[PDB]
């Protein structure tokens, strides 16, 4: 239970919601043929379209509710410690990036952090200890223009029972100069890119303890692997 709520440039905090197509509530999406999963639930909307640098390095700040904790000592904020799952980034390269229907646009990766067997770490434990924030850097080759920027969390806590994997998405609007002429070579659909078959989706993460550390086995992220320039 958590939003995608804010986004920093090279450390400038661009001001909560600005620029976000984000859901006004942190329930999941647990189908993953919805249209909820393109940008998360429909909610909150902005005209602001962040200007950004190819190869500039982009936050993402969630919190539990709009605004950060929901109570003092929230110990869900920015997400609960239970939610281990892969955090993704993808783009999808639009005209004009405040009007732009969210539906049947051609996504790419670009980012991932999802899960270090040997340190048993989780891209959501990684979230928990950067307060929130997850970091990547925008490709240096990604052509100049309008994107969408989406951001998600897979929470895999629940997710040994079918359809009960639980996602958290919101996108941000960018525009990005300085860019280059790259291309990618194929890309994928949202809803579609994600079956509920995915090993990454439909999986049991606790070992023998139960504790969730997967038991010490690689995890396979669901989507294609982010491209590199
Ligand atoms: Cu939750």
Known sequence: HAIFQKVSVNGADQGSLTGLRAPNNNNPVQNVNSQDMICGQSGSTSNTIIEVKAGDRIGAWWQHVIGGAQFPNDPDN??????????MAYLAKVDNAATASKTGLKWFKIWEDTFN???????????????????????????????????EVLALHSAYSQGQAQFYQSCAQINVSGGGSFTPA??????????????GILINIYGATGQPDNNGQP?????????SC
């Open 117 to 151: 067997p040997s340190t048993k770490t989780w891209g959501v434990d990684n979230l928990i200890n950067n307060n929130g924030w997850v970091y990547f850097n925008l490709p240096q080759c990604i052509a100049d223009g309008n994107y969408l920027l989406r951001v």
């Open 78 to 87: 920015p997400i609960a410690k239970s939610h281990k799952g892969p955090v």
């Open 186 to 199: 194929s890309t994928v659909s949202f809803p579609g890119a994600y079956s509920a078959s995915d090993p």
């Open 219 to 227: 995890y396979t992220a669901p989507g294609p692997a982010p491209i």
